[PDB]
């Protein structure tokens, strides 16, 4: 199906699941889960949470 990924988590949001935030910079931020969103709204870094593909990239575990 048509699929989008979390702007933070980088996991494919399945159709009908997730919340999209329109930032004041006119950028849509698609979020898979409430956890994906809460981490972003606390500005906690994506690259210090291991489950995120960003940290998977930094470890070079998944890139």
């Amino acid at each position: 199906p048509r699929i989008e990924h979390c702007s933070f988590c980088s996991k494919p949001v399945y159709p009908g699941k997730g919340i999209c935030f329109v930032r004041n910079d006119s950028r849509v931020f698609r979020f898979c889960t409430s956890k994906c969103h809460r981490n972003f709204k606390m500005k906690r870094n994506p690259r210090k949470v291991r489950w995120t593909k960003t940290y998977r990239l930094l470890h070079n575990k998944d890139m």
């Binding site: 009908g16 997730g18 919340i19 999209c20 935030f21 329109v22 930032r23 006119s26 950028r27």
Partner: protein, 132 residues
């Protein structure tokens, strides 16, 4: 214009919404919503794309304040569900001052504007930079 699908109403009366247009008003206080029948004890409610009767806050230019003005809410902080299943929310709650005829009182609409607001009001749609 057209028929508006119901969206969750996130801004009750007494809400203060930002101005998204260069009219010279900074903060708009929602006095009421157009087309509201009431139930005992129920404050009027409003959502993206709905005309709201607002008053300009003291921060606004003197000419704008001390009079009721019509406006359309274009951004809502509360998340709402579109028929396709998309749940969308905005960083801030904002509105643009517009006559019921549909003439904007402002040259430009700054920031993102909701698709629902843009379809219902034609002038907002051309002016808005982005319709996310």
């Amino acid at each position: 214009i057209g028929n508006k699908f119901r969206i969750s109403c996130g801004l009750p009366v007494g809400a203060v919404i930002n101005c998204a247009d260069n009219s010279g008003a900074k903060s708009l206080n929602m006095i009421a919503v157009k087309n509201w029948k009431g139930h005992l004890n129920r404050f009027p409610k409003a959502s993206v794309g709905d005309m709201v009767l607002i008053t300009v806050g003291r921060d606004g230019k003197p000419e704008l304040r001390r009079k009721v003005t019509p406006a359309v809410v274009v951004r809502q902080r509360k998340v709402w569900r579109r028929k396709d299943g998309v749940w969308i929310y905005f960083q801030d709650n904002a509105g643009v001052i517009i006559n019921p005829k549909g003439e904007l009182k402002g040259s430009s609409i700054t920031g993102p504007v909701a698709k629902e607001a843009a379809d219902r009001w034609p002038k907002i749609s051309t002016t808005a930079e982005c319709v996310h």
